[PDB]
Subunit: 114 residues, 4 copies
């Protein structure tokens, strides 16, 4: 698992469950090509997005649908979504965990690269 995402809910103190996200890879035409997607599990994690052979160097965008998450909970949110845009593997393949901590008017994102 070269790429994993973990989402936490700072209002309820819980994993953020059933949060949809899409991963895009930057194309030579400067556009974002669909690459992977899924929704977080009961533990707030999304695994199996890609494989090491497929996960080559490049620029990736993870677009997390936070707005739908807050709407499902009946809470008015600020952001349309949370985006994490990064260059992968510029040192060669390692492992990437992207964590996002969500509040209605704030989010934090951190990468753990190991």
């Amino acid at each position: 698992c070269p790429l994993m995402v973990k989402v936490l809910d700072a209002v309820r103190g819980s994993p953020a469950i059933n949060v949809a996200m899409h991963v895009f890879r930057k194309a030579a035409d400067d556009t974002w090509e669909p690459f992977a997607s899924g929704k977080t599990s009961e533990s707030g994690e999304l695994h199996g997005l890609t494989t090491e052979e497929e996960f080559v160097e490049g620029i990736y965008k993870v677009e997390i649908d936070t707005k739908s998450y807050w709407k499902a909970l009946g809470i008015s949110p600020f952001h349309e979504h949370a985006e994490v845009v990064f260059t992968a593997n510029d040192s060669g393949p390692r492992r990437y965990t992207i964590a996002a901590l969500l509040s209605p008017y704030s989010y934090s994102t951190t990468a753990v690269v190991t």
Copy 2:
């Protein structure tokens, strides 16, 4: 200002000075159109991006060039930039302060919205 951005550096405990950013507004054809741009001052703040008349309802994207900031300090950061996307003025004019706190492998963004 109806729109102000403030950026802090969590490594040095200072305002993040001379950070470039670009604001876009989503057009009718779902394209991002350039709206405004600027750089943070010595206080880490960017004022005067827009006016109440020009800042109409819509979806806005603030793209903060955090990578160039970290690179100039000798640091290779994780993120290409920090992005903030939001619907503005949907229930009438508001004033928006977007705050960003920067670390090489992490950032947070908060909005303060006042009537």
Copy 3:
């Protein structure tokens, strides 16, 4: 002010207003002595806690009563309070802005330190 505190509410996207806090300074016998206290204004800021003369070198603790804040909004939060402990003025007088961002189960605190 050599010491100012700013508190934001990440649930409502607003300054956190009327948040109480107490500042302590570590004494020679390693006890926390009361130093100053106050509440945030409508802008979420607390100014005038101390003066340059009184704010000597030492270890300081800012105890922000986040629990009473959340309770008054009908929310049962995780933390009893948010604490910030730091050595101040160790290399001469500085100005310290402590920023706190509050959610019911999370908080962050940053320091901006300027000469």
Copy 4:
């Protein structure tokens, strides 16, 4: 494991390894009694701090020695330590994960209660 701590380093994008912390329980005399301690593993986690029988309702303080962590890396930090003070189990025993994300002049802490 009713109480677990996870620490991440936001400067290096890694688990914060060998971070010492002490857990205190509030005593009736208004003082903090030593309860548990340890240091984070290679994965930035500290497990086995307590057992469900021992982890009763009360006020707990986790004092994370962030200053020594930054000093070991040669980086000047702002905080003396990071403290997390909370009331446990006021709804009865659940599971507590305390996460802390560290920068030299900033820290964030979040609780995941499941």
